Copies of this chain bind each other. A is one copy, B any other.
Amino acid sequence: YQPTPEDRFTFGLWTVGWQGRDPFGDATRRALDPVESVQRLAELGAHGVTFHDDDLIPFGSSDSEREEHVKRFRQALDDTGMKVPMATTNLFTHPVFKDGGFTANDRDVRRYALRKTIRNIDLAVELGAETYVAWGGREGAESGGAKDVRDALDRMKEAFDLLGEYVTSQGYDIRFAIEPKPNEPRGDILLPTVGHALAFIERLERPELYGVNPEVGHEQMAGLNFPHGIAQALWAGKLFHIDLNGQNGIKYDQDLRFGAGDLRAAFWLVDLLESAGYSGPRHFDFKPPRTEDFDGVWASAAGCMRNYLILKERAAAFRADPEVQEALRASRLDELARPTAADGLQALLDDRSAFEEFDVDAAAARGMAFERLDQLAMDHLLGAR
C-alpha cells in the first residue's frame, strides 16, 4: 500500500508542524522548518503541501524577510517536485481576531482581515494553488446578545463578494472553498455544517466561484453522517476540496489521523469519492498526538495515506463483487436510480396502480434485504470474504 504523488495526497504545514500545545499543556515538540517538512513529506510519497500565510511567513515579517521565506520555500518545492494546490489565511490566532475576522463587531478589524486575505491570495496564485480555503474559526459567539446573526451574514457575504470581485478583476484562476465547523474555538461557529455553507453560497453575487471544504471530524462533531454530507456537496457540484482526518464522536476537535475514529464512515467516504470520480487533492488536516516524538509524526502522516489506500482497495472489491451487485438489485438500488414519474404529473394522476388499486400490504411485506447487503460490505472491509 505505497503512496505515490499520482494519489494526490497533500498535507498542511500546520499538521506535521503541530507543536502539541493544547488547552491544558505546553508544546512537546520543537518547531519544524517548512523546508524540512516539504522534504520529509516528499519522501513519504505525498503530492504537495498547503499553508496558512502565517505558517510560511512569521506574523509581522518585513517584506525583506517575506521574500526570503518564500524563496527558500520555493527552492524546496523545486528540489522535491512537491506542489501547492491550496492555501489559506490565518484569521484566528492573533488576539486582534478574538471576535472574528470577516464578522468581527469592529469594522476596522474586518477591513484588516480582508487586506490580510488579499495579500495571501496573490501569493497563493504565484505558488500555483487552484483553491483558496476560508475557515471562519473565530466567526461566532459564546452568548446570544454578542452577535446579531443576520447582520453577521450580511458582513460575511460582503467579505466573500469583495474577494470574488478581486479575483475576477485580477484575472486569477482560483476558486474559494468555505470550511464549516459547528463549534471550537467559538461557542457556536457561523455556517456550522456543510448544508449551512452550501445554502450561504447560493446568496453570493458570483456563486460559481465558491464551493465547500468539508472536514471529516467537523461534521462528526455535530453527530452527522459525513458521507451523506459529501454526497449532497457532490450533488450540488460544490465539492472543491476535502479535509481528511478522524474523530471519535461528539467532543472536542480531535484531528486524529485519517482511518482512526469512525472507520466504517471512512470506508463509505472512500467508496463515494472514488465512485463519484472526485479528482481534487486528498488533503490531510490532522495533528499527530502530543504523546509522539518526530518519529511518531512521520508514522502518523504515513498511516493517513496507508489507510486511504487500504480502504480504496476494499471499496473497489466491494463494488466489483458480482454477489454484491446481486444484493444491490435485491435491495432495489437500481430502482432508486430510476425516475419516479417520467411519465409526468398527469399520467401519475390518472394511474390507478399508483393509488386506487395500489396493494399497500403486498408492497409493505417486501423485505429491503439491507442487513445481508451490510454484512457483505463488512466482510469486504475486514477482508473476510
Chain B residues in 8 Å Cβ range of A328: 145
Q: Closest approach, in angstroms, between the C-beta of A79 and any C-beta of chain B?
A: 28
A314 close to B193 (CB less than 8 A): no
Q: Closest approach, in angstroms, between the C-beta of A48 and any C-beta of chain B?
A: 22
Asked if A374 meets B137 with Cβ closer than 8 Å, knowing A112-B358, A151-B337, A250-B223, the reply is: no
Q: A194: CB under 8 A from chain B?
A: yes
Q: Among A158, A249, A264, A368, which residue has the most Cβ atoms of chain B within 10 A?
A: A368
Asked if A92 meets B145 with Cβ closer than 8 Å, knowing A114-B340, A378-B307, the reply is: no
Report the 9 A-B pairs with minimum CB-CB distance, sorted nearest first. A195-B196, A293-B367, A149-B231, A195-B195, A198-B199, A144-B268, A383-B383, A105-B332, A95-B364
B366 close to A289 (CB less than 8 A): no
Q: A331: CB under 8 A from chain B?
A: yes
Q: Closest approach, in angstroms, between the C-beta of A376 and any C-beta of chain B?
A: 8
Within 8 A of B (CB), among A147-196: 147-155, 158-159, 162, 165-166, 169, 182-185, 187-188, 190-196
Q: Closest approach, in angstroms, between the C-beta of A225 and any C-beta of chain B?
A: 4
B142 close to A23 (CB less than 8 A): no
Q: How many angstroms between the C-alpha atoms of A291 and B105 in the bound complex?
A: 11
**Stretch of A32-40, A69-77, A126-134, A254-262 on the interface side:** A254-262
Q: A316: CB under 8 A from chain B?
A: no
Q: A109: CB under 8 A from chain B?
A: yes
Within 8 A of B (CB), among A238-287: 248-254, 256-257, 259-260, 262-264, 267-268, 271, 276
Minimal Cβ-Cβ distance residue in B for A221: B251
A367 close to B196 (CB less than 8 A): no
Q: Closest approach, in angstroms, between the C-beta of A370 and any C-beta of chain B?
A: 4
**Can you offer 7 A-B residue contacts whose CB atoms are under 8 A?**
A98-B364, A165-B345, A182-B224, A188-B224, A195-B195, A195-B200, A307-B378
* Chain A window 14-40, contacts with chain B (Cβ cutoff 8 Å), 1 for yes, 0 for no: 000000111111111000000000000
